[PDB]
């Protein structure tokens, strides 16, 4: 799934985040890092591909022992401080057709403008469905990906949960 | 004795007092926190006095 | 919901394997039951038994708390599975290496702490000496009987 | 952990006969852990939700 | 707050402390290797100096995909809500 | 020294031998996996972006799993039977004999 | 709307970014990023105090005080 | 109590009598009414309790049984008409029917002086309850339900009406107060033995007694909002009212015979609560929650203490209101979504935010938060036991851990996390579900400030 | 704001923060000396602790051996 | 490995989307469209008063006519009494103790 | 410290027994010894309320420092004379202290020393 190219890759960023959390002070990690970069650059132009995949795998057992137990993570990244912390505050928004008229009230030109989106996601549904009919196999889609939108007045198929999804700081 | 006991009794009440508002009597939302930041200083005012008491005599009761 | 769309018996030939597969959404190589015993999980799927917490947090899962697709078979035990509860990820170190070193630091402080007991620390003193034969009246002591005398003495 | 850390000792002072004096390290140790949080507090807060002391540093002045 | 000028400045202005990178052939269309000749390895340390500047992380996924400055301008705009 | 995984700790994946030795058929396999994954994807999007759509989209894996999970007898009764009547006999013995203590017991 | 200061002034000359890329060059190799890191050695962030620093922060006007304050006490007890 | 039979008998032609759009609203404020004046029943002695005529009585036992009873349909009625509207008219008035029936079999039941009164009222609530479960469940196994309920009971309570013919013939009277002057003790013998679980099954099945419990989850799964209520708050402690009746006239063969139950209820409870810690189902942990708390009235009923009763009586009305709450709250769920799997609709707090207060004092007061009544009740029986051997309390503890471990769990599950994405129909509270909540929850939380009045004849 | 966020740079300050720091670690400072010099026997010691050796046989009442 | 021309095309189209949507979060300046040292001391002499005063007067009415009108209710610990106090009740003084040895 | 590593690493037939102490009577060696002489009454103590542990061989200066306390009040500053007085009061208890584990030490070492003079007998 993930091919020796992307392999080696992951590997090179993975290890130099763990040696800087080792390191910590930046003039230190700066040194290290060019060295742990030369390791990578002596291996560049390896075409015997059964040896290439000798040194990921002893590279890989080597970040394994030398990994650190309590590497620097981003806050809001998976297992980090902030991760999922403003979750609680995002609300989907079907949640305003709900709302009572007087709610309503107090935002008309929020509200308006509101109901010209929900006109566009009406009148284009019909062709992103088609279009989706059109470009995929007997067998299905084979892959995940989905494709842009080819006339104008088009628009990309399904892309409301895409465009109107919450802010990451909706409060 | 009743100075004592009034008053440490009243640094308990007044604590309870910005929950109670919640039932909506009297509520400013705009600055609870003030509210609430304002009640904790002056509870800490009012239990100054039987410790106070306590320091000097040793009262308890 | 049909019928032939819930869990059945245990597949007993290879025609019933390729249905229960097509069913659970899993390639027939892929699919697997759990031993025939009266265990009671009929052709429900065997599934890898490892945490939610080891998915790719990346991934656009439908369900990104549960890092879940809809459509795709759960593990039967996914509810203790969930982020909230068991982890199975790698850990840096080895499981039984983290269980002696452990078990090993709280089974020497335990010897140590015996030792301890056994040859207490204390200062070169004697007794504290208390007046009125060690207080006899003030710790409760009978008024009507008469305590043995304690005596201390000017050294 | 220093809190841990800290309750371990009171623990330790309850386990002499020293009563008044684990007391006595709750009422002291109540001013300056309360302190440091705060203070880490002011450091998480403007460095925008920071708290790995790896990339801390220079906040002396 | 973050601007699509704002962060352009900023993407820009890491680049060309980069020694490896002619601060003069540098704009925002510039690819990486073809254009700079750049290698992946070096395209992994631009990212890399990329989340150090704005602080989280691009997953590795999207991030072999970002082969010139307006690409990462976009990622970040789009991930911060950017639309101005 | 080489990772010993547990069931508590699992094999790292960049440490799994056969992570790095994937031919035709190993291949092959995944690309099914992926499409099987793609077609239920696609099943799912068309309802979630349905804009007609109010409700749950029910999922048939979900029912199937809560319908197949819906569908150490008498030892420890035997264990905590001898435990709990071994303690009443002697504290029963030590009553009739005086040699229990309960000068302040009388609340029960 | 916000004005960044210019790019050129961040120099490695006179930081241990300098004995980094000297150590480097001992070994055939070089420090591209060495620029990027180079603010934080500069400017207001150039020298900071040590930890035997930051613990006497204050002394030299709680000496003072604390000088001024016996003498005090001093004087008025031989009153 | 004919100042109770009456105007509950009227309510019928009450409801069959209103304009078609009334039947509701006038079933609904006249049971309210009658609720009231069951307040009058506080008229207790500390000595003699308050015997009315020759067929009813009512000391401290039943007449918070009686009160809960009549609190709870008003607001049976109040949390069905919903799910109801589709119905015909008649249908509708054939339902409210059959729980105002549920009432009236349930008042005399719990005041009747003589023990086959009791017998015969106390199989009669059967009818209704079955009727209710089968006819107006939802799923196609609410028929095995309705069987395995059905006969469920009538294995042990064959047993228990030729006990008591058999205890009539030996003592000449069942009346229960001639029974506190002429009971004699029970001698060891086969035949006590078989006396002693004829005059005990049918209430260990109807608690229910761990190890016979597995028709009450089925029983819940299949019952309509009204059904659960009903079944958890009041049909579970009739069991409890019986047990509590029938011992007085089984010591001291009690002594030996409570042991395997005891052991069967001290571990039941530990088993019941770890289970809701794995259920998918929200109203099946909730049914599994119910068998755990009764498990512990068991042990205070076995024991037989002054503080195992006051615990047992406490217990029974604390977990009536908790646990028919908690269905109230989990049909709440149910009618947005059409489903009891736990984990398909998470983070509901984000989208119904008082909803999430309810929930949060539901739990807690199922894992017994003091000064809750709850706690007062399980705190009594867990001292009471501790006497009894003090190996208890381990299993005690443990239990309340779990307890928490597996309340929390559901709030949680349900109420915390990220929403269900797809979920898009998660409509505003209604304010009849809002008060439907409150009208549990108050009552339970004002019975802190004067609990003496739940805590039985012990008291 | 008040305080304008910089860019690579060694931030704002106002006048108030500063003094105010060095009032209370100059603060702290004159405590502990003040204290230092009325209670030092608080660190040092408050009394002399008396070297057993030196008592003599007479005073702790230890007979001749030869007796 | 960057992005195809049609992974391109569909990122732009559904960012243009996003930030239009975005842009309409905005609110308006009418919205929202609502329905129609004196004064620290009065503050908090106001404070003071509702939530001092009332208090106290209702707790010392409560505990000087109803709980301290019930035995055992408020139990200090008596007063400690030194050598050479003079107790107020009755006048009576207590000795001073006997004479130290110097030290 | 140092008595300790005699006892536990060393002979401790010779050294005192913390728990068991004094175990040689109180005159053998001492002609006519005086009684510790309490000033404060059992009376006095009681009404002081004094803890129980307090209620030693100095509480007198203890009494004398707690009315000087209450006294003075608010300025808790002063009595510092008065404390000063019980805390050397104290001191001097615990030298005594120390008195009776050397005296019983040696006590100890003459009685080996004297076995070794019947062994040599
Ligand atoms: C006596 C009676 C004992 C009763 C024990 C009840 C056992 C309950 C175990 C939990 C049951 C499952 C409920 C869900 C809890 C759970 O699974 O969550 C796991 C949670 C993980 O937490 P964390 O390590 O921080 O990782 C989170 C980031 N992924 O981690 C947890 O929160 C659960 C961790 C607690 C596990 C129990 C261990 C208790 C300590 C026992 C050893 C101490 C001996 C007793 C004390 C000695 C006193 C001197
Ligand atoms: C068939 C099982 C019946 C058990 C035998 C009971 C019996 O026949 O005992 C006879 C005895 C009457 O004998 P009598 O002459 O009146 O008095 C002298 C006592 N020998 O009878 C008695 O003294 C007591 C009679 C009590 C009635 C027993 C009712 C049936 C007992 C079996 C069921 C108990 C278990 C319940 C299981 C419920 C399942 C959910
Ligand atoms: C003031 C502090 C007071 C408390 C100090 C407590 C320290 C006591 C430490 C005791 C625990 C030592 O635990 C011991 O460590 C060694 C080294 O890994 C282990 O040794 C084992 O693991 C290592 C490494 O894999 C290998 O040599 C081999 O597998 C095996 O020898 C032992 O299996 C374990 O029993
Ligand atoms: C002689 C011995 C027998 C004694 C009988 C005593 C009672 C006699 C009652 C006779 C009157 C019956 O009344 C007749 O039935 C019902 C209720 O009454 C009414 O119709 C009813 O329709 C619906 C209910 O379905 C409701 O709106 C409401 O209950 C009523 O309007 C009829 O419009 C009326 O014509
Ligand atoms: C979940 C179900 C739990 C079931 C628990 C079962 C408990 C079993 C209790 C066993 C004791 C039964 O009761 C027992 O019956 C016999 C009847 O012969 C009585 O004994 C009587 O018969 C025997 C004959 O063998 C004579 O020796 C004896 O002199 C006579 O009194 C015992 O006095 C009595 O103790
Ligand atoms: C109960 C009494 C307790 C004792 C009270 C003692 C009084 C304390 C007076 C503190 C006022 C000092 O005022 C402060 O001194 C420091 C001296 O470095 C100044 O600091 C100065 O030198 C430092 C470098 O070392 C830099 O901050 C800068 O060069 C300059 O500001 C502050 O700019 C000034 O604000
Ligand atoms: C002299 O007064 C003794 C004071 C105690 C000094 C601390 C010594 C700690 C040694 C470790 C003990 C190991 C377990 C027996």
Request: no cysteine; proline share 3%.
């Given at each position: 799934y993930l091919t020796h190219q992307q392999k080696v890759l992951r590997l090179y960023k993975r290890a130099l985040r763990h040696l800087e959390s080792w390191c910590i002070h930046r003039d230190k990690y700066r040194y290290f890092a060019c060295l742990l970069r030369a390791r990578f650059d002596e291996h560049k132009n390896e075409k015997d591909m059964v040896k290439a995949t000798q040194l990921l795998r002893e590279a890989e057992e080597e970040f394994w022992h030398g990994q650190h137990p309590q590497p620097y993570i981003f806050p809001e990244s998976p297992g980090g401080t902030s991760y999922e912390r403003y979750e609680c505050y995002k609300v989907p928004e079907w949640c305003l057709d709900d709302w009572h008229p007087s709610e309503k009230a107090m935002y008309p030109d929020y509200f308006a403008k509101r109901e010209q989106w929900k006109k566009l996601r009406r009148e284009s549904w019909e062709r992103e469905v088609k279009q989706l009919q059109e470009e995929t196999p007997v067998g299905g889609p084979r892959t995940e990906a989905l494709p842009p939108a080819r006339k104008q007045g088009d628009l990309p198929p399904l892309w409301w949960h895409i465009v109107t999804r919450p802010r990451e700081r909706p409060m | 004795m009743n100075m004592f006991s009034s008053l440490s009794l009243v640094t308990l009440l007044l604590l309870t007092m910005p929950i109670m508002m919640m039932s909506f009597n009297t509520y400013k939302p705009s600055n609870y926190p003030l509210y609430v930041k304002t009640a904790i200083s002056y509870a800490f005012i009012t239990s100054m006095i039987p410790t106070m008491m306590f320091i000097h005599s040793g009262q308890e009761l | 919901i049909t019928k032939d769309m819930l869990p059945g018996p245990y597949p007993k030939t290879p025609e019933e394997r390729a249905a229960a597969a097509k069913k659970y959404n899993m390639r027939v190589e892929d699919y697997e039951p759990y031993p025939d015993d009266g265990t009671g999980y009929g052709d429900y799927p065997k599934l890898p038994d490892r945490s939610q917490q080891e998915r790719d947090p990346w991934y656009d899962w439908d369900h990104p708390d549960l890092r879940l697709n809809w459509g795709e078979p759960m593990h039967w035990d996914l509810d203790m599975y969930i982020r909230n509860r068991v982890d199975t990820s790698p850990t840096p170190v080895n499981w039984n290496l983290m269980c002696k070193h452990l078990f090993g630091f709280v089974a020497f402080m335990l010897f140590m702490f015996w030792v301890g007991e056994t040859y207490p620390a204390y200062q070169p003193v004697g007794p504290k000496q208390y007046p009125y034969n060690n207080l006899y009246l003030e710790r409760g002591g009978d008024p009507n009987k008469e305590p043995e005398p304690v005596v201390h003495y000017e050294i | 952990f220093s809190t841990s850390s800290q309750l371990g000792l009171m623990m330790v002072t309850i386990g002499i006969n020293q009563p008044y004096l684990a007391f006595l390290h709750i009422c002291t140790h109540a001013f300056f852990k309360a302190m440091l949080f705060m203070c880490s507090g002011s450091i998480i807060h403007s460095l925008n939700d920071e708290q790995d002391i790896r990339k801390m540093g220079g906040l002396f002045k | 707050p973050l601007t699509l000028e704002g962060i352009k400045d900023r993407v820009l202005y890491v680049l060309k402390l980069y020694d490896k990178i002619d601060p003069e052939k540098l704009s925002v269309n510039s690819h990486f290797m073809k254009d700079l000749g750049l290698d992946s390895l070096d395209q992994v340390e631009i990212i890399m100096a990329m989340e150090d500047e704005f602080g989280f992380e691009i997953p590795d996924i999207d991030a072999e995909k970002l082969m010139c400055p307006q690409e990462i301008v976009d990622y970040i705009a789009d991930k911060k809500d950017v639309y101005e | 020294p080489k990772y010993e995984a547990s069931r508590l700790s699992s094999l790292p994946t960049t440490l799994d031998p056969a992570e790095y030795d994937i031919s035709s058929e190993t291949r092959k396999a995944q690309a099914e996996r992926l499409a099987i994954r793609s077609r239920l994807k696609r099943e799912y999007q068309l309802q979630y972006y349905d804009p007609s759509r109010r409700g749950v989209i029910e999922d048939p894996a979900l029912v199937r799993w809560t319908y197949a999970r819906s569908a150490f007898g008498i030892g420890p009764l035997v264990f905590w039977y001898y435990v709990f009547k071994t303690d009443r006999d002697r504290k029963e013995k030590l009553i009739q004999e005086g040699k229990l203590d309960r000068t302040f017991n009388i609340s029960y | 709307k916000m004005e960044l200061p210019d790019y050129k002034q961040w120099k490695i000359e006179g930081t241990p970014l300098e004995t980094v890329q000297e150590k480097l060059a001992a070994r055939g190799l070089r420090d591209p990023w060495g620029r990027n890191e180079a603010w934080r050695y500069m400017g207001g962030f150039a020298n900071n105090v040590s930890f035997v620093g930051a613990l006497l922060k204050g002394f030299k006007w709680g000496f003072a005080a604390f000088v001024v304050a016996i003498g005090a006490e001093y004087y008025l007890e031989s009153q | 109590m004919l100042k109770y039979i009456?105007?509950?008998?009227?309510?019928?032609?009450?409801?069959?009598?209103?304009?078609?759009?009334?039947?509701?609203?006038?079933?609904?404020?006249?049971?309210?009414?009658?609720?009231?004046?069951?307040?009058?029943?506080?008229?207790?002695?500390?000595?003699?309790?308050?015997?009315?005529?020759?067929?009813?009585?009512?000391?401290?036992?039943?007449?918070?049984?009686?009160?809960?009873?009549?609190?709870?349909?008003?607001?049976?009625?109040?949390?069905?008409?919903?799910?109801?509207?589709?119905?015909?008219?008649?249908?509708?008035?054939?339902?409210?029917?059959?729980?105002?029936?549920?009432?009236?079999?349930?008042?005399?039941?719990?005041?009747?002086?003589?023990?086959?009164?009791?017998?015969?009222?106390?199989?009669?609530?059967?009818?209704?309850?079955?009727?209710?479960?089968?006819?107006?469940?939802?799923?196609?196994?609410?028929?095995?339900?309705?069987?395995?309920?059905?006969?469920?009971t009538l294995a042990g309570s064959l047993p228990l009406l030729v006990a008591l013919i058999y205890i009539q013939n030996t003592v000449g009277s069942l009346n229960f107060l001639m029974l506190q002057y002429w009971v004699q003790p029970v001698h060891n013998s086969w035949s006590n033995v078989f006396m002693w679980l004829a005059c005990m099954m049918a209430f260990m099945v109807k608690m229910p007694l761990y190890g016979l419990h597995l028709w009450l989850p089925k029983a819940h799964v299949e019952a309509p909002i009204a059904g659960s209520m009903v079944l958890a708050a009041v049909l579970l402690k009739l069991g409890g009212y019986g047990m509590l009746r029938i011992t007085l006239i089984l010591n001291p063969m009690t002594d030996f015979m409570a042991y395997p139950f005891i052991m069967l209820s001290l571990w039941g409870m530990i088993m019941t609560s770890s289970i809701c810690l794995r259920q998918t189902d929200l109203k099946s942990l909730i049914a599994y929650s119910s068998v755990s708390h009764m498990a512990l009235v068991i042990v205070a009923i076995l024991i037989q203490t002054p503080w195992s009763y006051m615990g047992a009586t406490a217990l029974m009305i604390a977990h009536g209101l908790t646990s028919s709450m908690l269905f109230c709250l989990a049909n709440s769920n149910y009618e947005r979504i059409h489903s009891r799997t736990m984990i398909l609709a998470r983070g509901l707090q984000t989208l119904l935010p008082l909803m999430a207060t309810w929930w949060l004092l539901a739990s807690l007061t199922n894992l017994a938060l003091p000064p809750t009544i709850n706690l007062i009740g399980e705190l009594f029986v867990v001292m009471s036991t501790f006497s009894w051997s003090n190996i208890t309390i381990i299993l005690m503890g443990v239990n309340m851990v779990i307890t928490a471990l597996y309340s929390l769990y559901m709030l949680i599950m349900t109420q915390r996390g990220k929403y269900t994405y797809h979920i898009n129909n998660i409509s505003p509270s209604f304010t009849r579900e809002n008060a439907l909540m409150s009208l549990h929850i108050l009552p339970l939380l004002l019975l802190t400030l004067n609990p003496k009045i739940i805590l039985g004849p012990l008291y | 704001a008040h305080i304008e966020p910089r860019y690579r740079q060694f931030p704002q300050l106002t006048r108030s923060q500063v003094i105010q720091a060095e009032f209370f670690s100059a603060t702290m400072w004159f405590w502990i000396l003040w204290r230092f010099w009325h209670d030092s026997d608080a660190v040092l010691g408050h009394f002399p602790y008396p070297d057993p050796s030196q008592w003599t046989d007479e005073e702790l009442g230890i007979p001749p051996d030869d007796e | 490995s960057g992005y195809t021309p049609e992974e391109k095309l569909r990122l732009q189209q559904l960012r243009e989307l996003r930030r239009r949507w975005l842009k309409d979060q905005e609110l308006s300046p009418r919205e929202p469209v609502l329905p129609p040292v004196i004064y620290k001391t009065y503050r908090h002499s106001i404070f003071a008063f509702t939530h001092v005063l009332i208090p106290v007067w209702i707790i010392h009415y409560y505990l000087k006519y109803h709980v301290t009108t019930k035995p055992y209710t408020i139990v200090e610990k008596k007063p400690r009494i030194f050598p050479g106090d003079t107790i107020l009740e009755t006048g009576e003084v207590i000795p001073p103790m006997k004479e130290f040895p110097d030290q | 410290g140092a008595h300790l590593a005699r006892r536990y690493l060393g002979d401790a037939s010779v050294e005192p027994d913390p728990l068991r102490m004094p175990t040689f009577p109180p005159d053998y060696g001492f002609p006519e010894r005086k009684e510790r002489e309490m000033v404060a009454t059992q009376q006095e103590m009681n009404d002081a309320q004094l803890v129980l542990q307090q209620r030693d061989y100095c509480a007198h200066y203890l009494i004398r420092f707690l009315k000087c306390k209450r006294d003075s009040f608010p300025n808790f500053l002063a009595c510092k004379h008065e404390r000063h007085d019980w805390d050397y009061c104290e001191h001097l208890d615990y030298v005594k202290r120390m008195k009776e584990f050397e005296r019983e030490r040696r006590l100890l070492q003459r009685k080996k020393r004297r076995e070794q003079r019947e062994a040599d007998m």
């Open positions: - | - | - | - | - | - | - | 009456i105007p509950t008998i009227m309510l019928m032609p009450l409801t069959w009598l209103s304009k078609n759009n009334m039947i509701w609203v006038n079933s609904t404020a006249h049971s309210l009414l009658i609720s009231f004046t069951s307040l009058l029943l506080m008229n207790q002695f500390g000595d003699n309790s308050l015997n009315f005529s020759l067929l009813f009585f009512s000391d401290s036992l039943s007449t918070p049984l009686l009160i809960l009873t009549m609190w709870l349909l008003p607001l049976m009625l109040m949390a069905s008409q919903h799910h109801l509207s589709k119905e015909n008219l008649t249908r509708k008035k054939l339902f409210i029917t059959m729980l105002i029936s549920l009432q009236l079999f349930l008042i005399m039941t719990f005041t009747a002086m003589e023990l086959i009164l009791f017998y015969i009222l106390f199989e009669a609530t059967l009818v209704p309850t079955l009727i209710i479960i089968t006819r107006w469940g939802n799923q196609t196994e609410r028929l095995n339900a309705g069987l395995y309920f059905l006969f469920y | - | - | -």
